[PDB]
Ligand code: HEM
């Protein structure tokens with residue numbers, strides 16, 4: 001029914017192993033099989049991330065930005081050095097105290113929604129929850145979330161973000177405090193301080209990498225719980241399954257469908273030739289439905305123990321935001337289980353990704369849902 005996300009890649013995954021799409025006259029070969037997505041994600045020499053800024057993104061962003069994202073657009077061994085700088089900052093959501101503040105934010109927004117009765121989840125719920133949670137990760141004042149909410153859910157809009165980041169970098173530059181900007185400006189890369197340009201590459205990536213993905217993860221979870229009262233019930237009675245429930249939702253929703261790489265030399269994948277200087281994609285969504293790897297791949301098995309999903313990527317570039325994202329979803333699932341009796345989906349419109357030969361439901365442009373109290 002309505003919460004379903006179908007697998008548009010099945011026939012091609014099983015028959016050829018790959019697909020094609022056009023994106024700004026820079027054509028893509030999509031890798032669809034779990035085995036191949038892993039081998040290719042691991043093999044950075046042949047399939048590289050350190051390209052012209054914006055080239056590995058799909059759709060390509062070469063025409064809307066010049067700044068290199070870090071560590072996203074850097075290859076090992078330099079990748080490892082930058083990643084070691086920011087990785088302790090990204091593990092902060094594992095702290096008790098960070099989790100209490102996040103529990104209070106999510107709990108407050110769930111109570112407000114139970115009072116309003118019905119709400120438009122994408123904007124009134126998911127975007128608010130994501131913007132506020134992000135203030136904990138950046139360690140900025142709560143109020144900064146109102147600016148981010150205003151941006152909503154593309155050359156001129158892009159520059160709104162880039163210029164905002166520059167202002168923040170300059171402000172922290174003059175008056176160092178404890179926010180992520182100040183921490184990055186004071187960090188060392190091989191015995192010297194990071195430059196503003198490097199900080200900008202971390203921060204643009206931090207804002208852009210976690211916005212849409214989190215908003216869809218949150219929204220798709222609510223949709224799914226709305227149509228599956230038995231799942232809401234298991235989560236209430238068996239809180240111990242919550243962690244595995246979150247991984248299973250990231251596998252099935254795969255909020256980030258694919259990511260590109262640039263092919264450095266002539267080579268083959270599934271007996272198919274790919275020429276140097278072209279792009280492939282690591283199609284995480286398809287790998288996460290591979291019937292050679294997952295039992296019942298097109299359902300949510302709420303307590304799945306064996307779950308080698310690639311929803312957060314694989315090997316070198318595995319998602320730094322995963323710790324933050326996981327805590328958001330763990331807490332959300334428990335807050336709904338302990339406070340909401342059931343839901344009704346009242347009206348919706350689907351967000352379909354145009355991938356040329358493939359049309360992929362990634363979530364909802366909007367969906368109106370009623371929450372009833374327990
Ligand atoms: C459920 C939500 C999320 C999903 C599904 C997701 C998914 C992914 C995926 C698949 C990658 C691999 C990219 C690649 O191979 O090139 C990735 C990388 C990354 N994500 Fe996320 N992400 C999510 C949330 C976040 C959040 C909230 C942030 C930050 C606030 C974030 C920051 C990053 C960063 C910095 C990387 C690059 C890591 C590196 O290059 O070493 N993500 N993410």
Ligand SMILES: COC[C@H]1O[C@@H](O)[C@H](O)[C@@H](O)[C@H]1O
Nearest residue numbers: 057061069072204205208209
């Ligand atoms: C790992 O994902 C990072 C990317 O997310 C994309 O959706 C952004 O738009 C890109 O600029 C880039 O940050």
